[PDB]
Symmetry: C4
Subunit: 212 residues, 4 copies
């Protein structure tokens, strides 16, 4: 009677799910959110195929570190393992959001990385890499996503979408927003001419400044 | 006193008409929705030239399989026959939505098909074909649309819009959304460079996964 | 005490002004609306420099056929004469809307006409012409706009915006919407490839069908 | 007890901060607003890192002409000095807004100026210049921004955003809006073909007309 993920975590997931829709970052489909509770070693993750505005507290699924569901009746998101494997291999990330946004996904389908034409990319790294292609909801995808997100808080999923993660849902949410905005900027610039990419040294500095 | 299309069907059509506007899939003009009742063999279809937010339950038109109106005073949508002919030739489709969306229509006016640069296209097929041109509201259009939608749940109407159909209004609605999103993705990618199209074998697999 | 433009006309102008903003056709600046009362020979026109959401019934300006203001304290729109000269030279138009929209204005600044890549252009003509450049609010502008709108219900104002007119405000409003949508379609298509323009004969037919 | 910036100024800053978000000019991040009180020689400026919809009256920071904070507990915007240096070197500007908008920022990352393809640019000048690059929140930035905004009410910040200033917050706000709209127009036109730039003489005239 205190051993499983708490009410407010489930509540947080439902709130940020809505907010993805309310800010039209995404319509809702194929997107998913999770949190990891490091003391408990439990992931709570959004259910499969349920509209973000129809998700109840009882729809959130709780899972142990090896994918054994321990709470909830609903199937977990088809991408539960893309989330879980990040929590298994990395300790700097406690909240992840998957989304099919617009311009990030555009870069994803070109299989092009996002460079630092805009400095705000630093919330995730000097650039965002694009994972190698794999079918949604499969182990290859999750593995491809863990590898290409190494050293970053975001990665593009080829022909698919975006994955981002941070210390909490607020911060995970802002990283999607900010990475979608930078991808938007970068695509539009590239219609006009040659976007100017800030050098690595400046991006290094940027990382340091963002720490504070 | 139970022989004609039911209250809730008419209600469903009015709701999804609004939702096309409320999500700015379309402004309202030249768009139309219908359902087929297979036991009754009756199509209920939106009226002609009535703003989606001014359609009453009594404005919905009910029609038999040969286009004989059996309920309602209003003229049926000028595209009643583009809808009806799909219900006459196909049993996997019970709800259809026509819409003038943005990027699908852009592909429609280039007379370019939508390939599988994004996997979610699978809600409709491996690709969306573009019908041969014909004047709105005519028999050639309906015939051109039935033929080019063969084997799919969507087709582009040259210089015009989009047509999609599924087992119900919810699913028809999501197919427009999803096909508009994929067309958007595909156009934007093509501004940047060469969009990567997933191969037929993967799309085949995608079809199977979506069944579940 | 019945000789001047009526309450509901002034009300109609305020409503459609808002609706330009509420549908984000335009933000508000440099846009203006008028109606002509043909029995009275009076134009009511929106005031100068007043935010569409701050216009009162007493802000609407009433003017005779030679520009003599007969009702209202506010300066009339700086474009009062671009409106008035259409009512002086044409009897098929009783309501006009000026707007700085997005893609129509884009065509306006390229000084490129809108051809019939989308059939809905027929609410205005087979194409929309672009007027020759002149400084906002001047006689050359109004004259350039009257001439290039000949035979149409819309014209593009070089480096400026759009002008449209119809038998009433509802219809004038829909023509802006529809012409902005077609310009949007046409620009986007032209990013991808060669938009297919429907021939004059088909557009002729389209005109006839729209009459009904 | 009348020596510091007034309640309504702080209120004005909070209102226009929201309105940047409510009109989706910007999402909120890295944007900031200030006013200068010339009789008092005090700048009130938005706080650092606080969401525009969570800023209280007590969060607004008041500062003297040399950057000494005289009111408020919060850190001032990281760009306090980009604002302050404009008030130190120029008397025609009493309110400034910084923002990361879309198409202005796109021009900023290409390091391309905005010419007069649309006449409304005149609310800021004949063109908007792009400042030389410098790291957000630093003295080089502020200096680069003061210099490249000379003779204008707006400047683009390379790989960053936009800065604009006017006699008050209302007018500063409209200049961002209007400059973002013109940048949007200009980028889109440049996708299609060669945008037509109005000549300096016409822009000179435009300046004079806007005075009235
Ligand atoms: Ni417990
Ligand atoms: Ni019956
Ligand atoms: Ni009277
Ligand atoms: Ni005091
Ligand atoms: Zn997904
Ligand atoms: Zn249609
Ligand atoms: Zn204007
Ligand atoms: Zn900034």
């Amino acid at each position: 009677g205190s051993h499983m993920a708490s009410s407010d975590v489930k509540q947080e997931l439902i709130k940020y799910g809505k907010k993805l829709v309310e800010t039209d970052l995404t319509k809702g489909t194929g997107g998913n959110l999770s949190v990891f509770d490091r003391e408990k070693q439990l992931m709570a993750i959004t259910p499969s195929g349920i509209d973000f505005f129809e998700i109840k507290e009882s729809d959130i699924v709780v899972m142990d570190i090896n994918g054994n569901v321990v709470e909830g009746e609903r199937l977990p998101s088809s991408e539960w393992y893309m989330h879980l494997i990040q929590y298994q291999t990395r300790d700097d990330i406690d909240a992840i959001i998957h989304a099919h946004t617009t311009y990030a996904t555009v870069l994803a389908c070109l299989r092009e990385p996002l460079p630092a034409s805009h400095y705000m990319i630093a919330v995730a790294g000097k650039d965002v890499r694009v994972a190698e292609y794999a079918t949604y909801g499969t182990k290859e995808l999750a593995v491809n996503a863990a590898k290409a997100m190494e050293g970053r808080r975001a990665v593009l999923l080829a022909n698919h979408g975006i994955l981002a993660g941070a210390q909490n849902l607020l911060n995970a949410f802002n990283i999607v927003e900010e990475v979608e905005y930078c991808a938007k900027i970068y695509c539009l610039a590239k219609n006009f001419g040659e976007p100017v990419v800030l050098p690595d040294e400046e991006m290094e500095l940027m990382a340091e400044k963002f720490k504070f």
